[model samples]
Target chain A: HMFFLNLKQINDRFNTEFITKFKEILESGWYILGKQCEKFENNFAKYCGVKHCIGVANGLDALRLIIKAYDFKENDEIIVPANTYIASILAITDNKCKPILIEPDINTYNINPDLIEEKITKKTKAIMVVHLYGQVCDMEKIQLLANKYNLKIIEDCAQAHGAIYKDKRVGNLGDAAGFSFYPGKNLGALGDAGCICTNDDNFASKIRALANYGSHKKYENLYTGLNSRLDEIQAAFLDIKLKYLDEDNNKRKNIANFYLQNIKNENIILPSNKFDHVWHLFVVKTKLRDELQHYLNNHDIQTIIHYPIPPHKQKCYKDLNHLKLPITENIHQEVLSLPISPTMKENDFKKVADILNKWKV
Target chain B: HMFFLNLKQINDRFNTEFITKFKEILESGWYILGKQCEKFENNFAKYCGVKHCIGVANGLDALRLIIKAYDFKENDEIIVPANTYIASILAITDNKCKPILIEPDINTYNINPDLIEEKITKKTKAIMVVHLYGQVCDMEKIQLLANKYNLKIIEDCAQAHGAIYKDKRVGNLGDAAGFSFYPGKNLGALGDAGCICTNDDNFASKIRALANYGSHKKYENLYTGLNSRLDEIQAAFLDIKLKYLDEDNNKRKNIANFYLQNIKNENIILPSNKFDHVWHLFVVKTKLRDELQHYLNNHDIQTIIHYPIPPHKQKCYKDLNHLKLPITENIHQEVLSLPISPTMKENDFKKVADILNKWKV
Candidate 1:
């Protein structure tokens, strides 16, 4: 039987290694913002080809700090994809800036570069682009728009760790990027952890301070900041896992390819092979999304809706609920994320494909 | 020889126990907001004799979420002690509320309840009382004022874990309280961790949702919330350590008593023996504070200034710099914290007292 993700199996691949590192950290007596965090930050920055990587508590804080460091005034706007997760919009709103929602390209499920220009306004200060479902956005076009509008670009790379576009990693695609090491992310820690990647030294320093209670030195307050720090134990775990990220991502890619070629159901609309994707989630579309999900569940195939509701439609954003966003809403209704991970068995893939092909709905 | 805090020795008391739990958690692959967090939350609530305890990323977020749940309007005033750590003020300001700072009682180094009545205004919403350096505030008088003005009371119990006021614990003394488990606290996790304790079911539910991206259900957001969750691994570690909190606190208390009775220096002024003090920091005031610290350093007895700069005097709060708070300024300049922890040797305590008594400054 398959689960949506076999987290235990995936993590078990390095059981002894993790245990060894855990003991060392516990014995070290240093926990917060210590040597383990420093080592992992250095390694991750080098891996992403960025000048600096500042470790924080989670992906949400990573985005929040980036926006806070920019010091955007209240009521300033930040363009974001309507189809992405609510955390993206929450970050913008958390900083007291308005999030101007843009519809995604229905095929790629990313912010449509063509649609971003018209939303630009005098109050717009930045554009937050999410690399949804492990696929990178069209950064070349997005970056050009950022330059033209004189707006900063912040990439939400939470789903796209190790993903690439035009031979460049996702984290390096924008002015700064936020990466999540949530337990389920492609590059995950054992607990909640994240970091901000940026080539801008000044911006990186500002984020470092902002996440650490706004103090560059002990007991010295430079800015009103948050208590967001990546634990040293988590950093040690991440460092141990980082060495194998590429190998695991390739396994995920292989499974995605198999699902694309073997699942021959006519009603199933597979993901487009348009860009480099690490397949954090292997999403497919169908008019019979609900029925197909029920059928698959009967066959012991676990699946989840990437999102069953759009951000603009959520109760939390009732002010924006009245706004119409057809493409984003449709995707939320019809898309399903199938079982996908680096540890899936080859037979499991064939079994899922065969079950899908036999679906009467 | 003495040092500020032997974190390694303190934590090494449960070295094997921590490793066992860490391995178990690794194998479980259930990291965020899982059984470990639930168990710790339940235990902590019971320990404080409260109905609910919501675990968050750290002490600051614990304070932030409590204020956020109250839903105070922007610019509403929350009275706080000017003599406390900057985090107490930061929490109010982070919620977009003004922090109305009250000067401390010169002897107690806690908010002067007598002065609070005059500062109450139509815009005042709450009073943030800090139990600075592990001695509970004059909560009886403060609670009377809160009832008179219909204001909420939030206790900053960061340094005062297991501390008692009258017959009640600190967390149960106010409407709600925030407890810190920073590595050095009386009840500490191996890394940054904290919790909010309250008896109100409705308020506790609000805090639970607010800390978890404002979702009571999966993918259903009800508030513009935060990503502040306590890691399961840290929770497990804390549960193991929580068993020894009182014992460790007693050890800290013994050291404080030793310092109080034996250190006979004319220039040094000891803290008042009032209320149930856990002695998180054994701070003493002296006109020759810097000279005494240097003398202690020469004797291999490490010390630190509890705070060298008052919040109003810090560069981050330049707008408040013009305000005169003489008592807070004096305490910041004169207070020095001596080394105290559960793992300290008796000989180390004697060495520190002997060195202090011999100080020529």
Candidate 2:
């Protein structure tokens, strides 16, 4: 039932005020960069407590557009999470910027701000943070580091939808943030969709141009751009889901609470509670992660590793950065994500908890 | 109006089939890389008379993925039409292959095969022929050059859908062909969609891997990849529309016949008949192109220019090639597209024709 990231949730929403409003926009014959996107952008910007949010094709493009707006010279260093996904580093390097990889805080699974200052050099241009598992990172410290080094901060908020830290939203806490709406994301489009959020108007305007093939308007090339545009239909879908995000998060929070109270395992270390996490994935560490996962599967319980390979260890990332990151390396093997969606039912969680508590080698 | 091109004629087939099928896929839980994509791919392969037709994010990505698959070295030159959209040229450059812009054929607007042989050099890796305005290039001559020089030819069939080159379909006639469903083409999507038709199975498999961040399945990275995936809704839409495509083409053909018989302008140059000429776009070149467009616009007869700027002249393409072509520059100024969709009311075409008959500039 935890796998109830089901079609029924969508059906319930459609019958309400959302579907009719969205359908009217579709029939009106205006699709690209029009009222739908404008409304979504405005509503999202306010929701994120940011000045602007320009929708684009995907999360990677959102990050690429942010870098493109900077127009950095080759070899300029951009600090990226050493233990994060490859998309972050590729975006930096693909734009000819240097990527300085730093490790993550093992507890939060967020980028390690404490370790970032050591990587700073003359070439450093930006600090890119990945807010892992819908939990905010040390944004306060990251903001200070960015200010001290005069580096632009880009939030890889691909996972952090409506996540907050220090009374600030994830996207706003940075100079700019990239959010992906991939199908599996907390707030996902049926197809690929993403956005760039920032308080800087100039940054938003330029990135918007970059996303639209280097043109602000039709054929008015402002600079080099890729074909990175969120189609109108996806935008229409997002408008429907945006209103219910907080309510959904609360339900997810309820599920997390259920898991927290029910399970006890002597061999397994429970996830630390430092920040209010929406628990995009409830990751549990074990020496027997693979074995226990299989056991759980036999009992009809499903789970996945947040990543089987750490970014530093992955074949795509070895050449991108060189940094000391022991925590990311250690945690890579042990973190197993149990099924966790906002609407995940209590029985599913109890069963998962029971299987974990009673497990034998 | 006649200015609307094949879009007017094909839109019912476009709307009736695609819209209904698109909605079904939207409601279905399976959205990406699923049943819709599989069916569309199979049907499209058979239609093109090729071994495979692979769906990609869009037409540009189709070209980009092929270049990636071929492993073109940096500075390797790919010849493309100077009169085409910047995307064909840019896709080559985007893959780090140098784009060598060439002039279009005077009669058909496709890249001149005469120049293909002449442009060959040690660094020349590929030739991209745009089946511009729904007319096939002199594919036989182009293929002969490719064989002689051991170069690949990719057809950008962003305009042409059912167009044929001699006995073979336009898509099947080339080494590779890229088709864009940019909401205005013969097989247009609600938004952006694309496919790559190829005789080679290896190429098809590789493009699929490349489009999806370099993995056929989750958490597997064989190569560094760009994020480009066709929306399932569009795939389903195309699946339904493919059934009626031949009939839709007939409607488009009827309009082309009407234009050929009815246009009485001394200054207008009609495209040559080499193939079925599915009439994705019926472009008319004239010295008074701007005046004619305005004349049609006043009559509520909307028109478009196939291209107003040569690829070499576009700001986005400036860094990629150093080339000059007088004919491409001349044609860019003269080509104006007339509406010819099957759905177009007969009165719309009569209005466009009446203005053309009375025009003096």
Candidate 3:
């Protein structure tokens, strides 16, 4: 194992004091929505600087909740950042809102604020400002436009844990944010868990009922709701890990800094953390990305693409390709992520930089 | 905390050996599904003496998978125990099949095999037995009838974990079975994690894909699937804990025996631990259950009802009250649960028994 993200790192990062808290939870006999979930909700809101947080099953549901709660009229085109993972776009459609794909900024690898309004129609209800690869999507600029145009903003923060934009956490910057603590996330739980963060308490409450079969109380379902709940044990575990988020994020920043200083490749265009970028991923754009990946593998260095496709072009959404996002197409073949997790050390970065510099088409 | 079930006892039950293994999992990078899940699934399946154990996000999803794979026609009736948790029947109806409620046996607090066949209509496709309160349903008779009708029997072993029917484990005796690894379960995970056990390999593969967005392989969708999965971290912890399940269940059985022999309450009806039961719960049924629970609370003893309301009578099922099953209604108010975790000590049970013996209306 080159190095795997292990349990202690997660526990330390999450402050999940481990068997101590979990054992306490087990003995309490209060399994469903209770102190653990309530405390976590408050803690997450405090961290994100938002007024409310509604926990759900996963990030997809987190997104689904916002769109469903607003009752986005049918055929509502949600302008989505093309750089996002499929779930960001899939969630809008799953909520019965249409996703209007737009190209990403070549540098930030985030939704272009300029391109958002061009595609808006009376049917356009929201602009989903997705924070891809942990870079907050210039939410301040996007939110100003959203305010002017009567467009809602959905912040997909699955990759951006404790990520801020202009000193503001990603969640509070938009109308609402969708977050995933998908075990591997910077702030993750032991299993599938996600939540919606917002300044709007009403929206948070709506999704809360929606995710839990529309009932605040057990057996008293209100609307059509799914049994999407953050398990009490998982919540306790998450509460443990939520403590060291900034420190873990700092580890990712250190890796990015090394990559910024060391890589000498002229053909590669590396993303700049010049703004509010928490650097969930340090992506480098090179036409020779495939060659570089192969070379790195030979040197026992590992890498992954933040995404292989810009979602709209994936076979799952072949029908959505009419948006013709050429920049997204170019970026898809070029963007590559270097090894960057909290546990990754300095030597690993030097090795990555060495192989990356030597690689040629 | 009350002198009732406290953290110290829970700590002793939630072994550090297992938590140590869990610590390793928290740090492991493969967080979604990988080696940890593979190991847990294999071991969990083996424990149930089944060919496959497909892990999912929770017990609800575990039961949901049965419907996801089974192509039961729309509005087709899938018979379920009326005295079961809301999840048991909702998963069937949630997937488009009609949920036919079967009244449970008042004495055993399980689904009555005698009441099953008469409820089966031409549209009836399957029978899901709820092994409520940690005892196996009468699978031998149910299986015989299921064979005669050429219907599938899906055992809701959310409660009856290691419970046995004749010489076999409760799960393996049916066509398929689901176990809830809720924190309250005999084999509970730290979070809401569950596994589907089945003799059918094809069914196992299908359910796996169904829980994970219908794609077994990358970049393909088989059918509409939910993104429910056991987090890699939960799986690793579970893998370690699976080894101790039998021993833990044995402890529960030992503790339960003490309660049965010592509790001198005249109004009580104790549960049967006949055959090899892996006691997930120790339950009792009596007209005075609510009064006993209240009296115990006054004495600082904690007790809970397995379900205060059965599925058929739940406000969530106001839509289904049209079915009008009388037996289920009677037992819903009669049954309640007392402290019987493996964490519970003999003296704890003796104390509870002493309180119950002196309990007044």
Query: For this target, which candidate reaches the highest TM-score against the unseen true structure?
Result: 1
Candidate 2 regions off by >4 Å? A1-12, A15-26, A317-325, B1-27, B318-323
Give the TM-score of each candidate.
Answer: 0.99, 0.94, 0.84
Order of all candidates by TM-score, from best down to worst? 1, 2, 3
Give all candidates' CA lDDT scores: 0.90, 0.77, 0.76
Q: Write the per-residue lDDT of candidate 1 for residues A1-361, one digit (tens) a residue.
A: 6788888988898889888887788678789899999999999998898899999999999999999999989999999999999999999999999999999998899999999999999999999999999998988888999999899999999999988889789899889999999989998988889999999989988898888888989879999898999999889989988998999999999989999988888888899757889999899999989998899999998898889988999899999999999999999989999888888888888898889988877
Q: Write the per-residue lDDT of candidate 3 for residues A1-361, one digit (tens) a residue.
A: 3433444444554445666776676567566677899999899999999999877778877887788788877788898887677777767766667888888887678888888778888888889887788877776667777888898888888988887766688788888888988876778776688998988767777788877766777545555566678877778877877787888899888888888988888888978864666776788888887887777777887777766666776655667756677889888888788877777767777888887777765
**DockQ scores of all models, one per candidate:** 0.82, 0.43, 0.23
Interface RMSD value for candidate 1, one decimal?
Answer: 1.0
Interface root mean square deviation of every model, in Å? 1.0, 3.0, 4.2
lDDT of each residue in B216-322, candidate 2, tens digit only = 76665666777888888778777777787777777778877887888888888876667557887788889888888888788777788877766666666565335
Residue-wise lDDT of candidate 2 within A56-142, one digit each (tens)?
A: 888988998888789888899998887777788778877878777777777777777888999899999999998887777877788
Query: Could you tell which candidate, 1 or 2, scores higher by TM-score?
Result: 1
Docking class of 1: high
